[PDB]
């Protein structure tokens, strides 16, 4: 009943509407800092010289953007990977021109989101649950690190991290395809399999459970009222669902164990997104997608184009156009 | 060849700018998220129904009893995220709804692109940028990328057109 | 910026009209209970 122990007990209390926890003690200020700076910058920040060539890119709503085109623009290439906090600028005017808000937002956000993951562990422990929901969230979290930190580290500059904007996101992924060919990289192909298969199995599971709801209601009422929060009995018939799905395909391609089924639901998209985050994190060090450019030639030696060469023509167009005033030398080596 | 299809649609249709695709994206990413978050919640709110460290064996397809605690799952997510599911039927219907709707939305956008009815441009942006050579946004930067995609891939991608683009007309930035 | 002037009323009714619809149905649901 000392001041510290009381404080510890409030921080870890399971009676708080929103759990705080020790990870929350870091998460809350860092997320509030990131959020408040993000909203203000998105609305009112002036143009930012993202590529360090004194060519400022306007990202905020008051400087002529809408919701789709607006962004918080990445920090200047002149800064590269240097730490650029506010107190390192001669003035806020300078900090804004060179892209300081980006660095403030992404570092606070990554910290806050890492703590979000730990906080998912922590509350699970306080409630006597199994611990691994936080491992599912490591897949999205890893993906955010990849585009905001790891890729900028490998390329040498936060100016090549993903913009905090909708069209800026697209710019990022187009230029990534020209410089890396993410599409011909197997870790991206597994990320697609992870999210497509994730959407598929979401629909499957939802439709099979919804297909086998036990009749508990009249046709004049939502069938959802046939389930009461906390009832002990299951609300659908898994044997009927299995009897339907195993005939749709064949018997042994259908689950009859709900625990294996839900583990599979968890595992497939998490693992696919781990791979795609590792794709970005390894193309950060320029180990790029397969290059089959001019791989097929004829008896004489003429090049016989494949669809890979057609991809290469599109990549070339993205390459020669991007950051059109920023290259003085023939190779875009970073 | 599908990879080439994607890139074609970026350069010619600016398909990423299309809100029907955007709704599709939300639906597929949202479905994947739902899939992962539901499987992990169930697996981490299981009831102890057997003594083994392999918790799979303690489920029987004919048991009537729920195998995980909706109540503890609801508390966890309410305190972590603010909101949680409380209705199992709604939860699983929502899992049907999200990706099915997203895919339907994207199909609609592609129908429009059948007619070149694109969401290619913002007119306000183009008027300003035409008049003000210091105005630049991520929207104008991506259209330069599209213009490169089209000019650099059309001759080989559309061989029946007999496009001959001499070097001097290819759009290119400095040095590259 | 030279935006479509009618975008504003378009956006306003797009928000207002379905939102009002829901609120009407919600409030008359509460006053049954």
């Amino acid at each position: 009943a000392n001041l510290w122990e009381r404080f510890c007990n409030w921080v870890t209390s399971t009676d708080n509407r929103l759990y705080v926890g020790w990870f929350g003690v870091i998460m809350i200020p860092t997320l509030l800092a990131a959020t408040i700076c993000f909203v203000i910058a998105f609305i009112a920040a002036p143009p930012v010289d993202i590529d360090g060539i004194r060519e400022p890119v306007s990202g905020s709503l008051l400087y002529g953007n809408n919701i789709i085109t607006g962004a918080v623009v990445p920090s200047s290439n002149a800064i590269g990977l240097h730490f650029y906090p506010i107190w390192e600028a001669a003035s806020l005017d300078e900090w804004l021109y060179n892209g300081g808000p980006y660095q403030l937002i992404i570092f606070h956000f990554l910290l806050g989101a890492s703590c979000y993951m730990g906080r998912q562990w922590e509350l699970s422990y306080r409630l006597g649950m199994r611990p691994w929901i936080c491992v599912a969230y490591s897949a999205p979290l890893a993906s955010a690190f990849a585009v905001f930190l790891i890729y900028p580290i490998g390329q040498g500059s936060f100016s090549d991290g993903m913009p905090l904007g909708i069209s800026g996101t697209f710019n990022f992924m187009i230029v990534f395809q020209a410089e890396h060919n993410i599409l011909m990289h197997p870790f991206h192909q597994l990320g697609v399999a992870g999210v497509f298969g994730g959407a598929l199995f979401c629909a499957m599971h939802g439709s099979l459970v919804t297909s086998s709801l036990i009749r508990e209601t009249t046709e004049t009422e939502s069938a959802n009222y046939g389930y009461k929060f906390g009832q002990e009995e299951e609300t659908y018939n898994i044997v009927a669902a299995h009897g339907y799905f195993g005939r749709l395909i064949f018997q042994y391609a259908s689950f009859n164990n709900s625990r294996s089924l839900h583990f599979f639901l968890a595992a497939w998209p998490v693992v696919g997104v781990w791979f795609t985050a590792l794709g970005i994190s390894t193309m950060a060090f320029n180990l790029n997608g397969f290059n089959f450019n001019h791989s097929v030639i004829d008896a004489k030696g003429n090049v016989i184009n494949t669809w890979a060469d057609i991809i290469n023509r599109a990549n070339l167009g993205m390459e020669v156009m991007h950051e059109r005033n920023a290259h003085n030398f023939p190779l875009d080596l970073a | 060849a599908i990879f080439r299809f994607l890139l074609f649609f970026q350069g010619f249709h600016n398909w990423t700018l299309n809100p029907f695709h955007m709704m599709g994206v939300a639906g597929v990413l949202g479905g994947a998220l739902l899939c992962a978050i539901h499987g992990a919640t169930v697996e981490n709110t299981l009831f102890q129904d057997g003594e083994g460290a392999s918790t799979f064996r303690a489920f029987n397809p004919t048991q009537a009893e729920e195998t995980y605690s909706m109540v503890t799952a609801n508390r966890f997510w309410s305190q972590i995220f603010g909101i949680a599911f409380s209705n199992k039927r709604w939860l699983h219907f929502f899992m049907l709804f999200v990706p099915v709707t997203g895919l339907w939305m994207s199909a609609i956008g592609v129908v429009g692109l059948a007619l070149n009815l694109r969401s290619y441009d913002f007119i306000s942006q183009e008027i300003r940028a035409a008049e003000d050579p210091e105005f630049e946004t991520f929207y104008t930067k991506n259209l330069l990328l599209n213009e490169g995609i089209r000019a650099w891939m059309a001759p080989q991608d559309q061989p029946h057109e007999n496009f001959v683009f001499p070097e001097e007309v290819l759009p290119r930035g400095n040095a590259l | 910026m030279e935006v479509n002037q009618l975008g504003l009323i378009a956006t306003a009714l797009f928000v207002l009209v379905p939102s009002v619809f829901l609120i009407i149905l919600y409030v008359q649901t509460e006053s049954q209970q």
């Binding site: 509407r17 609305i43 709503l61 809408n66 | 109540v71 603010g82 909101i83 949680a84 | 504003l8």
Partner: peptide, 30 residues
């Protein structure tokens, strides 16, 4: 006017988050 509209909708969503969390219908056991 467009800026005002974008920010108004965004602020209405934040306000909705607040009611949805603190003024939700309480889940009640059975």
């Amino acid at each position: 006017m467009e800026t005002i509209t974008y920010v108004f909708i965004f602020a209405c969503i934040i306000a909705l988050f607040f009611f949805a969390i603190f003024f939700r219908e309480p889940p009640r056991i059975t």
